[PDB]
Amino acid sequence: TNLPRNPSMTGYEARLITFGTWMYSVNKEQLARAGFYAIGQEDKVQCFHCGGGLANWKPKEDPWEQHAKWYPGCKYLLEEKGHEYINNIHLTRSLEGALVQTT
Amino acid sequence: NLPRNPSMTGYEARLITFGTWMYSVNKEQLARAGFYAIGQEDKVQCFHCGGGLANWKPKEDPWEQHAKWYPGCKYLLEEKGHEYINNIHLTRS
Amino acid sequence: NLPRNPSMTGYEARLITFGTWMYSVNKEQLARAGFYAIGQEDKVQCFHCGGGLANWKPKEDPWEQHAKWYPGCKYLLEEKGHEYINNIHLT
């Protein structure tokens, strides 16, 4: 409801190290900063906070953008990027404390 | 108070589950109404209240069905409001 | 506090579980009283308190049976009120 699904991955370094032999086109530092950590299955990653998983990354994709696109309800995303950023990603305008759930 | 399937809180996350949706009800409307397909025929579930719906018929409105069957859903309440839910059940003056 | 079966919070959702109900006690009254059939003879359960009831007798009042057996039900309290429940138990 507010606490992260994987508190042991709250720190940047803890997440970064999971991308040991990261052989994919998406920057591991950007992924870690965006709250993602690798789960050891191809290029599959999950957010330490909302638990949202993402796979099949394409070259030059922005982790934060994908995070906001697929998991707009993430509290980590909200606290770090803010409501304005999330709304812009979804090309809309929502209310002050309203989650982007319908578009 | 808290969604049953938080990973389906986002519109796109729900929409994609309707990959090859061939049924009579529009998948965008279903997703907007909080529903996502479970990969079993036309079975769908609300990400918030967890209410499931199946055997969709042409011309049905996902929001109306959501309100009819699961009036207690908090997502329905927050998005549509009391007045809408009451009208669906005609519960009013 | 929270209902045992939230998917049965709505009247229609409960009523449809009675689609094949052939017992004396009226299905509409049962559903209104918060009950839904579980598919075992005339066995029903309240969506809120989870209280189960069976072996219904003709002319029985669902609300009265609900109050008699499960006076602690929050749904019963919110819908009927404390006075109704007390009267059923002659208090």
Add this chain to the structure above:
Amino acid sequence: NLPRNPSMTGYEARLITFGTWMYSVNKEQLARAGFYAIGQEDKVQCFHCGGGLANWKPKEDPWEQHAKWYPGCKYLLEEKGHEYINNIHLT
């Protein structure tokens, strides 16, 4: 706060579990004290704290036993009060 067996919150619901009760201790007194039979000899359990009791002795008082063994029960507290519980424990 919330009882361990809400379906046994009502007096009648508990009383009926003592249908074929063949023991010294009065079933009405047991039910009033919050106990219901589980169908194993003279074994009973409180609907609220879930505390179980067995091997009742003739003339034993259900409330006294409830207070003696399960002084932490919230049902016991609400119905009988601190003074009653403290007196049972001579404290």
Add this chain to the structure above:
Amino acid sequence: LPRNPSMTGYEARLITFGTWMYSVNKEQLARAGFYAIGQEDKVQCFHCGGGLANWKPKEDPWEQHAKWYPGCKYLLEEKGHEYINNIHLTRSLEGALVQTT
């Protein structure tokens, strides 16, 4: 909330020692919140769930409870912060558990 509410009462805990064949007095153990689990002299606190075994003669149940499980809420409510601090030969703020010494 206590790990085992059915053991909140003194008598309920006392009866678990049945005929106690070990070192420490069963009444003291029960008063300190412990109840026997049926494995040698192993006991556990009804509140924090902390288990203790291999008790020695003359040991003080309250003292061992405070030494090993200073975070126990039952211990805190019954004995207080100063008692716990003294056991650990230390002192802390009026809102800090003894978890570092």
Add this chain to the structure above:
Amino acid sequence: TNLPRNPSMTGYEARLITFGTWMYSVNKEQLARAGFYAIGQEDKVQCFHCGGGLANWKPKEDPWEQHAKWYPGCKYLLEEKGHEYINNIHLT
């Protein structure tokens, strides 16, 4: 993060005793003070509060520093060391 993952390891002594047969060089008292207790797999230790696990220690590493580096979100770390300490470890 709010309540301790392993409340039975809240006390210093309770944690220290898990190192009774510790066969590694990294100092056990320092590890225990830093909220860690041994689990039995390799030289793996775990924080009683955040549940964060650590292994492959260096003979002279500082457990408090490693705790802060890897698990900056730990509430035990915050309450005992404070924000400034954690920020300094991460050069922020």
Add this chain to the structure above:
Amino acid sequence: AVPIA
């Protein structure tokens, strides 16, 4: 009616 045990 009666409760289901």
Add this chain to the structure above:
Amino acid sequence: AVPI
């Protein structure tokens, strides 16, 4: 439609 109908509930599951």
Add this chain to the structure above:
Amino acid sequence: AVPI
């Protein structure tokens, strides 16, 4: 009586 006695606890179960």
Add this chain to the structure above:
Amino acid sequence: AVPI
């Protein structure tokens, strides 16, 4: 990317 796509959700798992």
Add this chain to the structure above:
Amino acid sequence: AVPI
């Protein structure tokens, strides 16, 4: 005594 010691912990279990």
Add this chain to the structure above:
Amino acid sequence: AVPI
């Protein structure tokens, strides 16, 4: 050290 390293996390596990």
